Amino acid sequence: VTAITKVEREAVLVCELPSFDVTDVEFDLFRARESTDKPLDVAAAIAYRLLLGSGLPQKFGCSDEVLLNFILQCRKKYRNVPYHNFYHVVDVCQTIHTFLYRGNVYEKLTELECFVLLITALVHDLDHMGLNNSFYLKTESPLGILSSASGNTSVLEVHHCNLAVEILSDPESDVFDGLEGAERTLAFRSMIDCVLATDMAKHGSALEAFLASAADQSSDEAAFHRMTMEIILKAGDISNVTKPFDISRQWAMAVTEEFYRQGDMEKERGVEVLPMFDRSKNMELAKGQIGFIDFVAAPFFQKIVDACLQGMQWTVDRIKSNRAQWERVLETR
Numbered sequence: 039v040t041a042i043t044k045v046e047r048e049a050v051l052v053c054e055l056p057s058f059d060v061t062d063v064e065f066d067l068f069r070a071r072e073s074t075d076k077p078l079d080v081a082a083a084i085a086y087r088l089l090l091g092s093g094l095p096q097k098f099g100c101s102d103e104v105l106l107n108f109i110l111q112c113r114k115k116y117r118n119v120p121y122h123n124f125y126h127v128v129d130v131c132q133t134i135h136t137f138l139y140r141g142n143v144y145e146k147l148t149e150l151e152c153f154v155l156l157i158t159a160l161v162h163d164l165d166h167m168g169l170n171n172s173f174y175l176k177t178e179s180p181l182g183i184l185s186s187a188s189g190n191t192s193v194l195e196v197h198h199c200n201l202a203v204e205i206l207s208d209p210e211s212d213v214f215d216g217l218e219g220a221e222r223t224l225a226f227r228s229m230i231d232c233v234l235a236t237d238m239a240k241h242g243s244a245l246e247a248f249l250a251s252a253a254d255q256s257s258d259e260a261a262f263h264r265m266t267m268e269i270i271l272k273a274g275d276i277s278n279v280t281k282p283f284d285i286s287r288q289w290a291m292a293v294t295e296e297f298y299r300q301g302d303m304e305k306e307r308g309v310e311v312l313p314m315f316d317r318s319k320n321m322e323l324a325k326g327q328i329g330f331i332d333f334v335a336a337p338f339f340q341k342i343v344d345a346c347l348q349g350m351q352w353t354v355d356r357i358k359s360n361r362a363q364w365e366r367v368l369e370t371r
């Protein structure tokens with residue numbers, strides 16, 4: 039890790055985001071990106087403002103400068119891929135901010151846990167190459183073989199955690215340098231547990247563990263806090279369908295192009311291509327979004343809201359409105 043320069047910091051600090059409210063559930067990152075010729079600087083400035091606006095870094099001895107170094111170190115480890123790039127992780131950070139502060143989920147967590155979640159959003163996909171865990175295992179890729187050999191099939195999530203630890207090992211980019219003892223341990227352990235929990239292979243069991251803890255008045259408190267953090271990073275990570283329809287659609291186009299490039303490489307390597315990754319099946323966006331809504335996103339958001347997350351009701355309302363809009367794309371085709 040080459041240290042961040044003053045010039046790199048200045049390029050972010052000049053961005054004033056005139057007319058954007060980064061705290062708003064209708065905030066539009068696509069419009070923010072189009073708004074200048076320096077979209078990576080605007081994205082960094084959004085993450086910077088969200089973290090300073092929370093008032094959390096200040097409280098844990100993270101200087102403005104170390105915060106901005108950390109953001110730029112994360113940024114340089116994201117790739118030019120259609121979906122799992124720096125814009126996705128800034129989106130998840132912004133979305134988690136809304137869940138915490140507009141959905142009042144902050145009430146369930148300590149300030150340190152709120153700080154860790156906002157920071158975790160920015161590390162949670164470090165050095166993603168636009169290929170899922172399945173690609174690495176099916177192609178017997180070196181990372182795939184290492185995962186199988188070491189007994190953890192969360193190929194990408196372990197890789198993300200490794201690069202997170204690497205950035206935080208330098209004091210100039212350690213947003214947790216203000217912490218010691220049990221607090222520093224909780225910050226690292228909770229960050230890593232959250233990233234590991236974004237593996238969609240663990241979706242069902244992460245959801246069921248959170249619901250069982252939330253229904254249990256005698257749940258271990260530390261365990262309930264940890265599962266709430268995991269569920270909020272998962273929620274941010276599958277939040278695309280909770281956004282205004284046109285933001286939702288732009289996300290779905292970006293993920294479809296990424297899946298298609300994976301399918302192209304799978305064909306090239308002669309491994310199995312799922313229909314959804316197959317550029318030649320040209321399956322409809324509308325049916326794909328409704329399917330993801332019915333089988334994954336609507337049940338997930340409805341169950342966590344009903345369990346205890348009552349303040350996040352708007353996510354369920356928007357999924358319902360987005361599903362009805364996709365139904366109208368079908369009805370009029």
Ligand SMILES: [Mg+2]
Pocket residue numbers: 162163194236
């Ligand atoms: Mg991920």
Ligand SMILES: [Zn+2]
Pocket residue numbers: 126130162163236275
């Ligand atoms: Zn992600």
